[PDB]
Design brief:
This is part of a larger assembly, with chains A and B. In chain A, the strands form two sheets. A two-stranded antiparallel sheet of chain A has the order 1-2. In chain A, strands 3-4 form a two-stranded antiparallel sheet. Chain A is mainly alpha-helical. By secondary structure, chain B is mostly loops. The chains are: A mainly alpha, B little secondary structure. The interface between A and B is small, with 7 and 5 residues. Chain B: Homotrimer of disulfide-linked HA1-HA2. Interacts with human CACNA1C. Chain B: It is found in: Host apical cell membrane; Virion membrane. Chain B: This is Hemagglutinin. Chain B: Belongs to the influenza viruses hemagglutinin family.
Chain lengths: 175, 55
């Protein structure tokens, strides 16, 4: 992947998470489960929807009858007509094929970028209060209940609130 | 009528062509002044190329 998250340091996808494209798995004393980050998912769904509509709706054609009829003494203009139909066929086929090829690659990179930014948003929030244990997972140095978990997902994690407890537990763990 | 001499000719001659489709007949009729065909050309046209005037 272009950004390294999908099929990268996050190795696989979650069939268990069904309500969103990008989300979270959590586990605390209150239990575990999957949840989807609604903001990032809806932003990506809006973006891709706009992309598909842009590809479709920018093609606005008028009423037209492609066919033409020529008699046996009009072979040259008949071939001229064929060249026009063929040239348009070649232009549209090649352009359509490459547009799908190139934009499909951009779409997968887009998802890869969205995952990386989501991981980095959390990592920049938790800082040293949690450990980066790989596969997109953070292991906390302080207890993080459901309310604390939602604050991380909401982008409102209070680092100073838990920094002292995490610091003491981190030093004890490392010692 | 007498035209200005071009290549020492005061008369003029107009040249005509037509393409006869397979199975068709072309008829010539004259009481004079007809420069008849002697050699005709069986041909099959392509998608048109062009003409280059160059040395």
């Amino acid at each position: 992947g272009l950004f390294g998250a999908i099929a990268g340091f996050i190795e696989g996808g979650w069939t268990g998470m069904v309500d969103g494209w990008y989300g979270y798995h959590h586990q605390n004393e209150q239990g575990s489960g999957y949840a989807a980050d609604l903001k990032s998912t809806q932003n990506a769904i809006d973006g891709i929807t706009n992309k598909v509509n842009s590809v479709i709706e920018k093609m606005n054609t008028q009423f037209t009858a492609v066919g033409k009829e020529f008699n046996h003494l009009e072979k040259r203009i008949e071939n001229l007509n064929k060249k026009v139909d063929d040239g348009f066929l070649d232009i549209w086929t090649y352009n359509a094929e490459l547009l799908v090829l190139l934009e499909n690659e951009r779409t997968l990179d887009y998802h890869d970028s969205n995952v990386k930014n989501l991981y980095e948003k959390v990592r920049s929030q938790l800082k040293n209060n949690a450990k980066e244990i790989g596969n997109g997972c953070f292991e906390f140095y302080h207890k993080c209940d459901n309310t604390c978990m939602e604050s991380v997902k909401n982008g409102t994690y209070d680092y100073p609130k838990y920094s002292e407890e995490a610091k003491l537990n981190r030093e004890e763990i490392d010692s | 009528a007498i035209r200005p001499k071009v290549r020492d000719q005061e008369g003029r001659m107009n040249y005509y062509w037509t393409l006869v489709e397979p199975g068709d007949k072309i008829t010539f009729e004259a009481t004079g002044n007809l420069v008849v065909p002697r050699y005709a050309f069986a041909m099959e046209r392509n998608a048109g190329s062009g003409i280059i005037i160059s040395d």
